[PDB]
Paper text:
Here we characterize a metal-dependent, bifunctional [name] from the leaf beetle [name] by structural and functional analyses. [name] in [name] ([name], EC 2.5.1.1) produces FPP in the presence of Mg2+, but preferably forms GPP when exposed to the heavy metal ions (HMIs) Co2+ or [name]+. Inter- and intramolecular cooperative effects in the homodimer strongly depend on the provided metal ions and regulate the biosynthetic flux of terpene precursors to either biological defence or physiological development. Strikingly, a unique chain length determination domain adapts to form geranyl or farnesyl pyrophosphate by altering enzyme symmetry and ligand affinity between both subunits.
Thus, in the absence of IPPHAl, the staggered configuration of PPAl selects for [name]+A and [name]+C. Once [name] coordinates the HAl site, the high affinity of [name]+ replaces Mg2+B and stabilizes the eclipsed orientation of PPAl, driving PPi release. In addition, with either IPPHAl or DMAPPHAl, HMIs abolish Mg2+D coordination at PPAl and enhance GPP formation.
Numbering used by the authors:
A (entry chain A): 85 to 107, 111 to 429
B (entry chain C): 84 to 107, 111 to 407, 411 to 429
The structure:
Amino acid sequence: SFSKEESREFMAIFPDIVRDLTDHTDIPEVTKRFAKVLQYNVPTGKKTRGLSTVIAYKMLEKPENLTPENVRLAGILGWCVELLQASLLIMDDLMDRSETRRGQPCWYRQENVGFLAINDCLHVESSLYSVLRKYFSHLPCYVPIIELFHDVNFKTNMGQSLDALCMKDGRPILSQFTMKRYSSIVKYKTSYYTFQLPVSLGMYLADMYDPEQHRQAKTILMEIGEFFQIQDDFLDAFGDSQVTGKVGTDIKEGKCSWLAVVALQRSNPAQRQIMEEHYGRPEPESTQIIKNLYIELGLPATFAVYEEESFNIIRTHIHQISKGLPHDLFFKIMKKIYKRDA
Amino acid sequence: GSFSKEESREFMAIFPDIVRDLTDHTDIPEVTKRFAKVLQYNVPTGKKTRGLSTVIAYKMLEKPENLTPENVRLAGILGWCVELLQASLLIMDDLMDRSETRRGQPCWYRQENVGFLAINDCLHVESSLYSVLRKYFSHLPCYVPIIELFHDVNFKTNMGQSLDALCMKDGRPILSQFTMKRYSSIVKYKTSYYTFQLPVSLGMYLADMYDPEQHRQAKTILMEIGEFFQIQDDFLDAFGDSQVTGKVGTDIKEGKCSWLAVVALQRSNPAQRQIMEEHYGRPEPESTQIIKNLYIELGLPATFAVYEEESFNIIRTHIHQGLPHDLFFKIMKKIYKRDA
Ligand SMILES: C=C(C)CCOP(=O)(O)OP(=O)(O)O
Ligand SMILES: C=C(C)CCOP(=O)(O)OP(=O)(O)O
Ligand SMILES: C=C(C)CCOP(=O)(O)OP(=O)(O)O
Ligand SMILES: C=C(C)CCOP(=O)(O)OP(=O)(O)O
Ligand SMILES: [Mn+2]
Ligand SMILES: [Mn+2]
Ligand SMILES: [Mn+2]
Ligand SMILES: [Mn+2]
Ligand SMILES: [Mn+2]
Ligand SMILES: [Mn+2]
């Protein structure tokens, strides 16, 4: 349901994650510093992935099996996803040369961090397998959960690589900016870790190992992932940095974003040359010239129309879900993200 | 095993399968073909001591009658999982230490159209070893312990790296904290766990040796060999031939808490100590050459050569004291007097 009481239930676990990873008695300098890394980077987001892990479980598990112990375990799995999100955001902000994350200067920009952000990134990722070891190592779901986290990370790395290959020799490859390429990027970059991981982690905690059941969840959770990333791409250019918590860099970094794809689809020959000349430039005047074209092409209105159609199209596909999977779970995910401004 | 040609041929024959197993996700050939390039350029170009050690350890810890071609090749695949971890750590390290060359070629992040994308490749190469472990070990009792060992050693290595990186604050090195105590802590976490304990511990788990005391006996002697090994690397950074070592040292420029910088301060007169304060951890080429000229004036090359001989003999005395001694003698014989 994504309610005040669940947000308070979830934030109550976080102190214990910090204690489990920091409280290696011969290097207190580093354990104390890693508490700061966790405190800064892990808990200040919307925590949708982590809260979806708990909601997924509660709606897949048999009502009679929903003990306070079993709910807490779903809470700890959640925070393991947020640990992965944290690691990915530390790296992403370095690679995309971002200014602000979640309302604060990006970790790598801070006084004595810089490239040390690369090590923190890797440290925050490996720390979740330590949390998994302490709480799940005596449960049937231990190996499958470990393997899902390894597979999802590998797939997320490939997403991030395909995302980075938008530029060669300082200029974007606008000829290759297709909706086919776009769909491949968000599938691997976003959908696997953001949407599949929480729901699958819910299924494994409930002992739901049926391959066809996971396959039915995957198909709709990929559609939701695409829908989600298109929202992120819109906000990067037209969002309020005060509300979103970040300054957009998609245009400056010359990303194959949903905006850039649709811009090219609808551009006249003079508008295409603008894109050629000014897309993916370090100059502020170029970024504004591109945003001005985006405005000119009615991409705000175009996004808003798509969002509403896509919401309805996805809902129709959720009503057709089979293999005894709960519909409401997927309606509840869509309700939480539909028309978001952060 | 004895680090022989045939053992390098046996170990290099598995590598094509590792690249096949990770790259041959059919809807994105652009990324899988690029990752085959990332692997080819970053994994097998080292000496491969860690990976070859993992095979040698197993051969010497497993019962002679249980050494099948199947079991030896599994120890090899474990060897490559160690070389994948190494490959990922080196990509990250070169970005952080602002290094020019690695293994005779430009550092990965300096290559045309890499840059900060080297941060993704770093992460991507580490996660790829857990895909290899899954395929070949998921049915064995040693699966979970081997998964966990890697996770633990990675976490430990990350903490090593951080301590190493806190040598500087506000552009100046913290020379008053450059002790042998701090140094022994850096190398323990940064080098010894993944370079020496990991191969041997993997060879034990594949031989179904789960006795904690046996892992604790091996650990004690392998921690000594790691400290020895890192001191050798610290000497080469400043006095090594870059054409031979394959890398241009940056320890003086980055103001690292290296053995050389620790011993320099221990023996420095008050004029020599101010030279360090003024010129250590400076980007300017003239500052790096002044420090190397001070290092030569404190007879540090002769100091290292004496230490290397002493420690080599002291460790051999510790090895003599049901684990196979020749394993630890053969590792020490490989790295003793090395110039790369
Ligand atoms: C996949 C993307 C777009 C990264 C950010 O995800 P969120 O927008 O959910 O970020 P937080 O709330 O966790 O900061
Ligand atoms: C792997 C991640 C973080 C998802 C997409 O990255 P983006 O770069 O598009 O994410 P934001 O910085 O816009 O949150
Ligand atoms: C921990 C250190 C000093 C990294 C280099 O190790 P090696 O000198 O074994 O590197 P390669 O053989 O793999 O190049
Ligand atoms: C690679 C790791 C984690 C060890 C760090 O040692 P260095 O930073 O000195 O590595 P080299 O360049 O000397 O190989
Ligand atoms: Mn970004
Ligand atoms: Mn990005
Ligand atoms: Mn974005
Ligand atoms: Mn280093
Ligand atoms: Mn280095
Ligand atoms: Mn070195």
